[PDB]
Design a protein around this ligand. Structure first.
Ligand SMILES: [Hg+2]
Ligand SMILES: [Hg+2]
Ligand SMILES: [Hg+2]
Length: 649
DNA sequence: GCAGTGCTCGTTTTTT
DNA sequence: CGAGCACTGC
């Protein structure tokens, strides 16, 4: 019903939800409710323009997002609403490559490569090419190769004109691929490019999709890279009508491939594409939006817009100058204690910082105050070492040619397959262009390895073959439990020293549970299905989930969240903005955008703080306040301070 | 391979 | 300043 979908929505949201089928850019301000627009828009396309759920493809970047969206779509709607592709670039890209793996030149069960895996593979290849890992860093190689793919550039496209400095990397890249392709491996970047290329080379397939997906919605468009923009464009073609939602002002992932352009490029490569601006904010108080507005104007790129609210101005924005970094912490904690002692929840308080560096000091301060908290730093579940070791065994069960999985657990736990043995193996793979496993088979046959070692290498191969069979007809969480024991991993981590050893076992226990609860769906078998899941869904950092805890994280990982109380620390020049943005650049505007984001995360109160002194790795330093703090209105601001009042008793 | 030891130098930053 | 970490001698 037309009113069912438009009544709760505001004037300009309706504009977006009810516009005619076409290409349009919905420029979503900060607390404007863009998701609500995306959800309502989709239900509108189905109910009003009467489109088939199979004609809709909403794409996001994070899984959290994909889920929130898949969830909300359901409740506004009747039921499941299947037939509708909702997911992330990588996720949807992965989906296509499975459905058309053969036409994509990929094997049945190709496996995905997470950062680590990829990083290690480069290291092995750089060495096996006799290159100085000291002056040819894998980390560097990685950046080169990922950056290359985010442009659709394969090795035979690199135009290294004369500097071997580049002609060399191309070499690495060429080997990396040759290897990956030989083992059935695909990294994140590959997923998009292979998909893209897939449409380029197979007209009928591309045709089949242009025919199905006529309604495309893309969120966070300001964070797309060149190949994603391209992938969308190619799919929309001439028929598809795409709605892109974005904020050219919250783009803060440029240092990894995000194109500030794309949001405008859309407008250019799309005449007729109108632009609906959502500027009513239902998040913050008027002062916050004021300061927010003010700040962001200082940047020049911008497509323009002013966040406004119907709510009261609210409390002013508190600024604080602390002695040193350790005082700044106590300040934040005491404001929070007050919050709490007045009935405030801890989980409604967030302390934001620019660098992970800044968390240490904050925690002790919180801990000392016996104040519960949660940090959102790193180490996802499917990235912990005990988990990857386990997965690499399952990985070997699916495909013996998974060099990455082989290299990882062949001698993990130690089973006597040393370096002199593995050195021979890794070289044979190069010279006879074979996958590690293949090479171990010919060498064994040829008896080219030292008897005792060879005997060990053998026993290994037999173990994997034995598990690949014995475990064929078992439930996923049974096969997992068996592999975790037979691999010898449990025994290894069982006897690992103290607290850490404990933690690693409790996680292997969690891996089985995750497998148990793993809900099927479909296209592939559970083990592969599950491996794909673990590679694409990092999966958080465990329990301690019920406690009312204060929220700590970097500004980057606060994007999209909102808290009544938001504390931003380290607001000083030399830290925010810092190095790069100082000695000449322009990443500065990105830094002010990051700032802008932080500011627009506050609902009731914002407290910015900085110190006159902090011990920046090494000596004491004396930073002055971020220019950002000075770019906020004087009326919306309120400076707090402690003064030495010596009263003669 | 692994336990210790001597030496970096600080990536702003996190997704998949 | 120290977490992380390339180096050997067993
Ligand atoms: Hg339609
Ligand atoms: Hg001060
Ligand atoms: Hg104000």
């Amino acid at each position: 019903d037309v009113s069912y979908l438009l009544d709760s929505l505001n004037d300009k949201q309706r504009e977006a939800v009810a516009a005619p089928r076409s290409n349009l850019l919905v420029l979503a301000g900060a607390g404007s409710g863009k998701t609500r627009v995306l959800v309502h828009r989709i239900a509108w396309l189905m109910s009003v323009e009467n489109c088939s759920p199979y004609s809709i493809m909403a794409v996001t970047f994070t899984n959290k997002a994909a889920a929130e969206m898949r969830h909300r779509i359901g409740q506004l709607m009747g039921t499941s609403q299947g037939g509708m592709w909702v997911g992330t670039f990588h996720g949807l890209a992965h989906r296509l490559l499975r459905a058309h793996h053969m036409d994509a030149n990929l094997p049945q069960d190709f496996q995905i490569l997470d950062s680590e895996d990829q990083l290690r593979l480069l290291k092995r290849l750089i060495k096996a090419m006799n290159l100085d890992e000291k002056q040819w860093p894998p980390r560097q190689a990685m950046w080169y190769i990922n950056s290359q793919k985010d442009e659709g550039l394969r090795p035979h496209h690199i135009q290294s004109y004369g500097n071997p400095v580049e002609q060399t990397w191309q070499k690495v890249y060429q080997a990396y691929q040759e290897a990956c392709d030989r083992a059935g491996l695909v990294d994140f970047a590959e997923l998009l490019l292979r998909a893209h290329e897939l449409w380029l080379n197979k007209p009928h397939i591309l045709q089949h999709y242009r025919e199905r997906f006529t309604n495309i919605l893309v969120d966070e468009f300001q964070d797309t890279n060149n190949i994603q923009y391209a992938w969308i464009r190619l799919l929309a073609g001439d028929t598809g009508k795409v709605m892109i939602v974005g904020d050219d002002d919250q783009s803060i992932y440029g240092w990894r491939g995000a194109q500030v352009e794309n949001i405008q490029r859309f407008l250019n490569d799309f005449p007729g594409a109108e632009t609906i601006r959502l500027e009513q904010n239902y998040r913050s108080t008027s002062n916050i939006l004021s300061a927010a507005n003010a700040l962001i104007e200082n940047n020049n790129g911008r497509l323009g817009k002013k966040l406004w609210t119907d709510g009261a101005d609210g409390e002013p924005i508190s600024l604080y100058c602390a002695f040193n970094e350790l005082d700044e912490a106590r300040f934040v904690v005491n404001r929070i204690k007050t919050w709490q002692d007045n009935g405030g929840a801890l989980a409604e308080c967030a302390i934001l910082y620019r660098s992970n560096a800044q968390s240490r000091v904050l925690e002790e301060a919180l801990l000392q105050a016996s104040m519960p908290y949660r940090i959102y730093g790193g180490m996802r579940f499917f990235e912990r070492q005990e988990i990857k070791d386990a997965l690499s065994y399952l990985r070997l069960i699916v495909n013996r040619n998974d060099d990455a999985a082989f290299e990882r657990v062949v001698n993990t736990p130690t089973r006597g397959i040393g370096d002199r043995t593995l050195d021979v193996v890794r070289q044979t793979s190069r010279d006879r262009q074979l996958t590690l496993w293949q090479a171990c088979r010919e060498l064994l046959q040829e008896k080219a390895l030292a008897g005792r070692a060879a005997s060990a290498l053998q026993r290994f191969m037999e173990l994997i073959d034995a598990l690949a069979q014995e475990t064929a007809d078992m439930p996923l969480h049974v096969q997992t439990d068996r592999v975790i024991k037979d691999s010898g991993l449990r025994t290894m981590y069982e006897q690992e020293k103290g607290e850490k050893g404990q933690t690693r076992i409790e996680n292997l226990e969690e891996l089985v549970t995750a497998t148990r609860q793993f809900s099927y769906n479909e296209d592939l078998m559970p083990l592969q299905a599950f491996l794909s899941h673990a590679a694409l869904e990092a999966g958080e950092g465990q329990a301690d989930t019920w406690q009312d805890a204060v929220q700590l994280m970097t500004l980057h990982s606060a994007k999209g969240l909102e808290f009544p109380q938001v504390f931003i620390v380290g607001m000083e020049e030399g830290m925010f903005p810092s190095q790069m943005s100082l000695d000449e650049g322009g990443r500065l505007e990105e830094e002010r955008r990051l700032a802008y984001v932080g500011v627009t995360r506050a609902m009731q109160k914002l407290t910015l703080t900085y110190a006159e002194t902090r011990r920046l790795y090494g000596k004491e330093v004396y930073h002055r306040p971020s220019r950002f703090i000075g770019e906020l209105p004087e009326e919306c601001v309120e400076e707090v301070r402690l003064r030495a009042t010596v009263s003669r008793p």
